[PDB]
Design a protein around this ligand. Structure first.
Ligand SMILES: CCCCCCCCCCCCCCCCCC(=O)OC[C@H](COP(=O)([O-])OCC(O)COP(=O)([O-])OC[C@@H](COC(=O)CCCCCCCCCCCCCCCCC)OC(=O)CCCCCCCCCCCCCCCCC)OC(=O)CCCCCCCCCCCCCCCCC
Ligand SMILES: CCCCCCCCCCCCCCCCCC(=O)OC[C@H](COP(=O)([O-])OCC[N+](C)(C)C)OC(=O)CCCCCCCCCCCCCCCCC
Ligand SMILES: CCCCCCCCCCCCCCCCCC(=O)OC[C@H](COP(=O)([O-])OCC[N+](C)(C)C)OC(=O)CCCCCCCCCCCCCCCCC
Ligand SMILES: CCCCCCCCCCCCCCCCCC(=O)OC[C@H](COP(=O)([O-])OCC[N+](C)(C)C)OC(=O)CCCCCCCCCCCCCCCCC
Ligand SMILES: CCCCCCCCCCCCCCCCCC(=O)OC[C@H](COP(=O)(O)OCCN)OC(=O)CCCCCCCCCCCCCCCCC
Ligand SMILES: NC(=O)C1=CN([C@@H]2O[C@H](COP(=O)(O)OP(=O)(O)OC[C@H]3O[C@@H](n4cnc5c(N)ncnc54)[C@H](OP(=O)(O)O)[C@@H]3O)[C@@H](O)[C@H]2O)C=CC1
Ligand SMILES: CCCCCCCCCCCCCC(=O)SCCNC(=O)CCNC(=O)[C@@H](O)C(C)(C)COP(=O)(O)O
Ligand code: SF4
Ligand code: SF4
Ligand code: SF4
Ligand SMILES: [Zn+2]
Lengths: 99, 178, 52, 45, 208, 52, 49, 96, 342, 114, 157
């Protein structure tokens, strides 16, 4: 930022890009290293009523996996089915489709 | 969505001006000359080199450096020998033994940190209930022998006494997030 | 990359091995001004990509 | 007090450019070849 | 609605259960179990000799098209007869799905390598043999890939110690890096971090 | 929130080092785009999951 | 011009470290002759600019 | 405070010191054994007793969230003051 | 004994062998091997050193953390010798030069320094002192070093009466001054032996065998006050030994019978050097002094070491000195030298 | 008491495989000693190969000895193609390990380990 | 003292100044810590300004920056490339892995510190130690090899 205008014009022409507009050395645009003290918010469960833990525990909502067929416990015309609907094709970008 | 990085759209045909431009590009090395010019621009820029050790790289109050044992404002050591840091230490770099002190308080007779085994992760300083063990921002403590990098309770307390001037200030500046 | 390492050290205290993302969220909140500093970095970074 | 944390300013952040921006610098090949041939002819003479 | 509970979708569970029924009735010769987890993941547990037909069907079937092998690994459960539970994680890019195929082995029954189906299975089965000692039939080059040269034992087995049996150090008398029996300056402290109160009643096993 | 952020996917056409290079550079650019959108759409709230 | 501005910054950087002895001292121990506002000094003698 | 053994080696606040015939002092020969000079035992012995009026006192060590978990000390025994289990500060109720 | 000197462990790197050994010639050739064995079994090894920390820094990995204590010492400093031997129970003396400097001569190195070390050790109260002299150091030998080592043995026994005196023969090893010397004769035209290398009998001993013997002397209860002779299994003539050395080197062999007085002249000509000499008059006298037969003295067998033969351990020394043509040559490609019973 | 074989139906075919592996190792040992600059002679390497085979000689299960043949063949290939170094080859000799004596007096004098 | 001791000391100071002013690392790294050593080579810190330039071959290398985890499969190669350096060779250990095993100290396939294999001159702690800290270690090594007196000990011999 302390460069003279002659070298500034020389580095701008030889690069082809405006380098003084986007300098890669931070000078004064950054935040101050000392900051005001913050005040972080509390979560949704920080309340004194209607906050029973048995209603908001997903950890004990995990069940053992459902057995579809079993060789031991069970001792064993419909459509052909696919594990998911087929992937829709990606659309070409409207911003910049080609470099 | 997606985009092509190398697939060109259709063809640019063949024109006499385009052929002359491609011939000039191949013969007179135009992209090589512009690469030279950009490196010349870097030559005429300002270097990003700081003057170590007279200039130091910027840091933050959260920085995890050399370990330290803090004290209360009365001067009593904050550690209460609860071994929570040793339990949480992922590298098992903390060894603690303790007994009741002469006045009946539970203070460590042995708080060793193998700093060659430490991974400098801050789990101890975020698990300590009394802010006893901390990571002061000293990183300039490289040694010449492996032995003197194995820290005991006296070294850790002495380092906490040494670095208390900025450790308390950093904890004041950052403690409201944690 | 060193500038981005200053960013991680401001978030977590370690320039490389943050251990910041944890099961259940992340470790701590963003310190003030970091978001503006990330904007200041990202505003100028595409010029360097064009240089490469 | 008031809840204070790192949030973007209410006016939103400014535009960040990301596209490839090559400078598109240079003179035409006809002029380059004309200067080269003129230099050759002057040197030969 | 609940901000601390992961949202669930029943449509993916239903599609994966339907596809599990589909695979189970297409291949009754090898499929021993089909299950869909609460996390919407489909697992088919098969006989060890049916690994080649199961993987080939899942890769080359029109309705399966599981053309990408995500990973191949083994789990050492040393309380059952066939202690190595071998897991194949597969990806379908056509239908954007993931499937898990499980089989079993022990220390003396090798299974068929699936290098002829997926080429990544070469290095993945080399890793499985190196870490667990499960041999693979018809492998092109089955050898160690992660352990040291001449390393005795398979270290990812449960009964193998964490620190191992030998360590390397440089000896100046023979001018070589040589292996010695394990001695630690500080022994690894084993922690008993297991609460004696039951955490999940949905997984309460019946008494013996 | 990758389903909420918007970006593009660089796709090669020749399967070589040059196309992989171009894909990496363009997805650096798309990462910069994602960074801009995340900067503008950072929401308020907590950090941990609210479950002790 | 601007070259004279660079040269006068150079001559004040030369004649801003006391004298020739001070300039040579700071140049040969710090490898940097930039002048700044004196922020502080320690009980050990460290100066901070 | 720090005290020296008959061997000349100073004793830590834990109270340990090597013996005269202990071979482990060659570890300290031509070097130093460092001991923290500030002892917590006498640094509390110099702390004054906090004289309060309530029957139950609450201590957090000072600084609020910078201290320890706050505990409640019952000041009923007139023959012995109440000591915080974390910070060691003594508290005494007023009988006048 | 003390509570901290009780042995513990299974004899590995992190074990405690219960020996606190101050090794004085630990920087040199035999010293690195004895320190290696001590740190291998797990010991409190004190290395008093005189040279640079870089020059001793190859010893830094010979033991576990804190089991090796390096400290400065001066040969003219009784205070420093006493501070080196203050906390120890074994003191091992390997101080020696093959030449004479202007600060230290043979008499000082082989008499005054071992006497001072033994006196400081006795006044400090160690219970085991081991001193390495040379074989055939009886008295009135033809070289100054052997006579000086003999009177040093006398002084060490006078001061410390139960000192274990170890007399090894010409020790061969990777960094020795014996096999590398005889292979270093290849840089000249011929090999100048006295009387064509005959009437000179040698039985070299392996450095690892000597070091194992020294360690077993540290832990041997009935070795106190004894003199051991550390000799190899086979006695060779000097001519056949040099012939086998050059055959293993695969370089060439041209011997030359050269008279002893002019060989001593050219030996002191090489020895008049400011640096480490290639050879000295004392070195060539020690080369052409024949080794005596150990009859009544105990040896490596009585101290618990099987002497490894030179034919078995010769290729780790002489493969450095061979060219690219003969680099991949085995043991069996060189005929072993003929042994002699006398 | 019926299992599935790996390569050999009975112990004789697996013994044939063991014999072939021993042939290949015995052929390789001089090449190893020549190529890697080893202190040992050809006799020492062949004695070490014999020692390892006799160490494994007590096995009578066809599957176990088939897997032992497989492991020996991988070690052999890892010796053919130079991946094991001088250190890796000399780890078979334990020349830096002081061996624990097998008698009760020595076991009693060293420590509490039986 | 006599005139010759001062001459030897000044020559030795010149020797040590050359040795510490030109020290070249072997282009050798292992892990995270190697990413940090190339971050020290990065333009902010400029080990080239400090006079410290990579050479790939150990024959042209002076200082060996063991930066990362030493495994049992890597230890013979580590010792080989240490021994193939010429005689004035110095070793700086970088990071907890190379110092004392680090986060894999209790591993079956990790050497518990690179000092079990190579003689380590100085140790730089951290995981990873910052490029600040590695530059501190390099300057400490320069001071350490400024401290030695080879010529003076040779004259005292
Ligand atoms: C020919 C060109 C010589 C260089 C020159 O004049 O550069 C100035 C200037 C460089 O501008 P710049 O790149 O922006 O300088 C960086 C800052 O703006 C300005 O930099 P700064 O403010 O950080 O400090 C500048 C200051 C810095 O002062 C010093 O470095 C003094 C050092 C004293 C050591 C005792 O003064 C100078 O650099 C004055 C010019 C010194 C040239 C010395 C040439 C001989 C070197 C020795 C040969 C033997 O040159 C020009 O503007 C045009 C150059 C061509 C002129 C024809
Ligand atoms: C000494 C004086 C200064 C010299 C220049 C110094 C500054 C510039 C330095 C530039 C950087 C060079 C670094 C190394 C680069 C290496 C790559 C390189 O150069 O490749 C060469 C490139 C290679 O091109 P290419 O490799 O891309 O081409 C493809 C070729 N195949 C398919 C085989 C791979 O160009 C050339 O070979 C051209 C050589 C120069 C030709 C000059 C012709 C001038 C015009 C002649 C007359 C025309 C008119 C005739 C009359 C008509 C009448 C009508
Ligand atoms: C020689 C040149 C050395 C470097 C000079 C500065 C470099 C930057 C210039 C600006 C720039 O980037 O331009 C990009 C531009 C190229 O941009 P471009 O790559 O976008 O191409 C322009 C567009 N088309 C494809 C239509 C042509 O450079 C030029 O236009 C000129 C390049 C050719 C001329 C230089 C090479 C031949 C020189 C032969 C004689 C030697 C000269 C005398 C030397 C005497 C001393 C040794
Ligand atoms: C500009 C290009 C040309 C430059 C030419 C050289 C310029 C300087 C010339 C004068 C000083 C030269 C001294 C270089 C010594 C380098 C090696 C060294 O320090 O060795 C230490 C050694 C020390 O030897 P030592 O006797 O301590 O033994 C150490 C060896 N061990 C550990 C194996 C026992 O050598 C010297 O001190 C030699 C001094 C030579 C003096 C010549 C006058
Ligand atoms: C001739 C004999 C004396 C040689 C120099 C001895 C004294 C010496 O080395 O002084 C150190 C001085 C500065 O070097 P240094 O300490 O590395 O600087 C730190 C800066 N951050 O070093 C110097 O100032 C450089 C000395 C160079 C001497 C001439 C070298 C040949 C040309
Ligand atoms: N080598 C042989 O052929 C045989 C040797 N011996 C004897 O065994 C002992 C050890 O042998 P070896 O290793 O080969 O000998 P070295 O030539 O290698 O030197 C042994 C040690 O003595 C130290 N030393 C020598 N003079 C002095 C002195 N004036 N002040 C301080 N230290 C000194 C040296 O230290 P520094 O490096 O600091 O100079 C060196 O570490 C010697 O007493 C030798 O006579 C016995 C039989 C055969
Ligand atoms: C250079 C040196 C490097 C040395 C390298 C050593 C390589 C070690 C390879 C180990 C290969 C094996 O151990 S697999 C073979 C083990 N299998 C057996 O021993 C089969 C059971 N044993 C027997 O039947 C034995 O009786 C015999 C001797 C093999 C056959 O005897 P028959 O007669 O009844
Ligand atoms: S330092 Fe903190 S966490 Fe560790 S034992 Fe002491 S009080 Fe507990
Ligand atoms: S920072 Fe992490 S690894 Fe280091 S002592 Fe604390 S908990 Fe252990
Ligand atoms: S010390 Fe830490 S940063 Fe360095 S290699 Fe080891 S794990 Fe990575
Ligand atoms: Zn309190």
């Amino acid at each position: 930022a302390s460069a003279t205008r002659v070298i500034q014009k020389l580095r701008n022409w030889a690069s082809g890009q405006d380098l003084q507009a986007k300098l890669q050395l931070r000078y004064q645009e950054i935040a101050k290293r000392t900051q005001p003290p913050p005040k972080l918010p509390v979560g949704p469960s920080h309340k004194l009523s209607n906050n029973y833990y048995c209603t908001r525990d997903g950890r004990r909502e995990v069940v053992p996996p459902s057995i579809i067929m079993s060789s031991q416990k069970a001792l064993v015309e419909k459509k052909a089915v696919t594990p998911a609907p087929p992937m829709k094709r990606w659309e070409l970008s409207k911003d910049q489709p080609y470099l | 969505t997606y985009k092509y990085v190398n697939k060109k759209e259709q063809e640019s045909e063949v024109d006499m001006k385009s052929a002359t431009d491609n011939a000039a590009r191949i013969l007179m090395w135009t992209e090589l000359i512009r690469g030279l010019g950009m490196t010349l621009s870097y030559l005429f820029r300002e270097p990003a080199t700081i003057n170590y050790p007279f200039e130091k790289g910027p840091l933050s109050p959260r920085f995890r450096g050399e370990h330290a044992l803090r004290r209360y404002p009365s001067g009593e050591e904050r550690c209460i020998a609860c071994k929570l840091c040793e339990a949480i230490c992922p590298a098992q770099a903390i060894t603690i033994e303790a007994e009741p002190r002469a006045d009946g308080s539970r203070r460590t007779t042995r708080y060793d940190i193998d700093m060659t085994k430490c991974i400098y992760c801050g789990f101890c300083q975020e698990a300590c209930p009394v802010d006893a063990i901390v990571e002061g921002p000293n990183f300039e403590f490289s040694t010449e022998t492996h032995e003197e990098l194995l820290y005991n309770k006296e070294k850790l307390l002495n380092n906490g006494d040494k670095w208390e001037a900025e450790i308390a200030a950093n904890i004041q500046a950052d403690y409201l997030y944690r | 990359r060193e500038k981005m390492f200053e960013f991680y050290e401001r978030v977590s205290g370690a320039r490389m091995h943050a251990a910041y993302i944890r099961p259940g969220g992340v470790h701590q909140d963003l310190p003030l001004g970091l978001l503006d500093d990330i904007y200041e970095f990202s505003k100028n970074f595409s010029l360097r990509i064009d240089e490469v | 007090s008031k809840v204070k944390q790192d949030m973007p300013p209410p006016g939103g952040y400014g535009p960040i450019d990301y596209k490839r921006n090559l400078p598109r610098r240079g003179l035409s090949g006809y002029s380059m070849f004309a200067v080269g041939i003129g230099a050759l002819i002057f040197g030969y003479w | 609605k609940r901000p601390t509970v992961r949202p669930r979708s029943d449509v993916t569970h239903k599609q994966l259960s339907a596809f599990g029924e589909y695979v189970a009735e297409i291949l009754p010769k090898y499929v021993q179990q089909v299950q869909v987890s609460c996390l919407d993941e489909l697992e088919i547990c098969i006989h060890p000799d049916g690994v080649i037909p199961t993987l080939t069907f899942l890769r080359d079937h029109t309705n399966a098209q599981f053309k990408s092998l995500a990973d191949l690994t083994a789990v050492d459960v040393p309380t059952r007869q066939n202690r190595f539970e071998i897991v194949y994680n597969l990806l379908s890019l056509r239908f954007n799905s993931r499937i898990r195929v499980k089989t079993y082995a022990d220390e003396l029954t090798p299974i068929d390598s699936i290098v002829s189906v997926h080429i990544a299975a070469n290095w993945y089965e080399r890793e499985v043999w190196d870490m667990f000692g499960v041999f693979f039939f018809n492998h092109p080059d089955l050898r160690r890939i992660l352990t040291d040269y001449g390393f005795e034992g398979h270290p990812f087995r449960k009964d193998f110690p964490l620190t191992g049996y030998v360590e390397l150090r440089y000896d100046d008398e023979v001018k070589r890096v040589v292996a010695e029996p394990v001695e630690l300056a500080q022994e690894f402290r084993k922690f008993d971090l297991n609460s004696p109160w039951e955490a999940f009643p949905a997984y309460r096993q019946p008494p013996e | 929130v990758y389903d909420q952020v918007e970006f593009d996917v660089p796709i090669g056409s020749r399967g070589d080092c040059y196309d992989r290079y171009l894909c990496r550079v363009e997805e650096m650019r798309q990462s910069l785009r994602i960074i801009e959108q995340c900067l503008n759409k950072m929401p308020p709230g907590e950090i941990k999951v609210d479950d002790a | 011009m601007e070259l004279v501005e660079v040269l006068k910054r150079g001559v004040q950087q030369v004649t801003g470290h006391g004298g020739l002895r001070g300039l040579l001292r700071v140049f040969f121990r710090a490898n940097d002759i930039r002048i700044g506002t004196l922020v502080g000094e320690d009980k050990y003698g460290n100066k901070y600019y | 405070g720090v005290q020296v053994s008959p061997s000349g080696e100073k004793i830590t606040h834990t109270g340990q010191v090597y013996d005269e015939k202990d071979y482990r002092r060659v570890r300290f020969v031509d070097r130093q054994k460092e001991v923290n000079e500030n002892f917590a035992i006498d640094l509390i012995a110099q702390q004054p007793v906090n004289e309060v009026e309530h029957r139950i006192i609450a201590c957090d060590g000072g600084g609020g969230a910078l201290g320890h978990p706050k505990v409640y000390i019952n000041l009923d025994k007139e023959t012995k003051t109440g000591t915080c289990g974390y910070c060691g500060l003594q508290f005494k109720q007023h009988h006048h | 004994l003390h509570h901290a000197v009780i042995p513990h462990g299974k004899g590995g790197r992190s074990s405690v062998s219960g020996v606190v050994a101050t090794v004085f010639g630990a920087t040199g050739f035999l010293g690195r091997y004895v320190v290696n064995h001590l740190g291998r079994m797990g010991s409190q090894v004190i290395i008093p050193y005189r040279c640079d920390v870089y020059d001793i820094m190859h010893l830094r990995l010979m033991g576990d953390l804190g089991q090796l204590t390096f400290l400065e010492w001066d040969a003219r400093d009784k205070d420093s010798i006493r501070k080196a031997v203050q906390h120890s129970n074994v003191v091992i003396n390997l101080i020696g030069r093959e030449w004479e400097t202007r600060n230290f001569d043979f008499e000082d190195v082989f008499v005054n320094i071992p006497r001072a070390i033994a006196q400081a050790s006795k006044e400090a109260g160690v219970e085991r002192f081991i001193h390495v002299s040379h074989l055939n150091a009886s008295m009135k030998s033809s070289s100054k070093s052997l006579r000086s080592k003999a009177v040093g043995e006398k002084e060490v026994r006078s001061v410390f009466p139960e000192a274990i005196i170890i007399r090894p023969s010409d020790i061969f090893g990777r960094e020795d001054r014996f096999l590398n010397h005889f292979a270093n004769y290849r840089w000249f035209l011929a090999v100048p032996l006295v009387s064509l290398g005959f009437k000179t009998v040698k039985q070299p001993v392996y450095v690892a065998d000597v070091s194992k013997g020294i360690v077993n002397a540290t832990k041997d209860p009935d070795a106190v006050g004894k003199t051991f002779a550390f000799t190899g299994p086979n006695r060779y003539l000097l001519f056949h030994l040099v012939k086998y050395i050059f055959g293993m080197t695969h370089r060439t062999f041209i011997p030359y019978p050269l008279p002893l007085f002019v060989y001593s002249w050219i030996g002191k000509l090489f020895g008049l050097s400011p640096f480490e000499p290639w050879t000295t008059k004392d070195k060539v006298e020690r080369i052409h002094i024949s080794d005596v037969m150990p009859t009544d003295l105990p040896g490596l067998e009585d101290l618990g070491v099987q002497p490894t033969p030179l034919e078995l351990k010769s290729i780790e020394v002489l493969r450095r000195h061979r060219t690219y043509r003969w680099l991949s040559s085995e043991i069996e490609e060189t005929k072993p030298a003929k042994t002699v019973n006398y | 008491t019926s299992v599935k074989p790996i390569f050999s139906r009975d112990l004789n075919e697996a013994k044939r495989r063991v014999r072939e592996l021993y042939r290949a190792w015995y052929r390789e040992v001089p090449n190893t000693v020549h190529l890697m600059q080893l202190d040992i002679t050809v006799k020492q390497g062949r004695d070490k190969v014999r020692e390892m085979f006799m160490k494994n000689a007590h096995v009578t299960d066809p599957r176990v000895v088939d897997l032992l043949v497989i492991k020996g063949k991988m070690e052999l290939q890892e010796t053919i193609k130079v991946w094991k170094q001088r250190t890796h080859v000399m780890r078979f000799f334990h020349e830096t390990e002081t061996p624990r004596p097998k008698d009760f007096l020595s076991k009693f004098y060293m420590g509490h380990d039986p | 003292r006599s005139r010759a001791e001062y001459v030897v000391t000044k020559l030795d100071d010149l020797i040590n100044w050359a040795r510490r002013s030109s020290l070249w690392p072997m282009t050798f790294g292992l892990a995270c810590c190697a990413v940090e050593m190339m971050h020290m080579a990065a333009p902010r810190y400029d080990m080239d300004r400090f006079g410290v330039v990579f050479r790939a071959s150990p024959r042209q290398a002076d200082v060996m920056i063991v930066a990362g985890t030493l495994t049992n499969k890597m230890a013979p190669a580590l010792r080989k490339v240490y021994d193939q350096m010429p005689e004035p060779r110095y070793v700086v250990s970088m990071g907890s892995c190379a110092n004392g095993g680090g986060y894999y100290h209790y591993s079956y396939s990790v050497v518990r510190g690179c000092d079990r294999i190579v003689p380590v001159d100085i140790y730089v702690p951290g995981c990873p130690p910052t490029a600040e800290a590695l530059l501190y270690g390099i300057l400490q090594l320069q001071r350490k090899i400024k401290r030695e007196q080879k010529l003076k000990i040779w004259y005292r011999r």
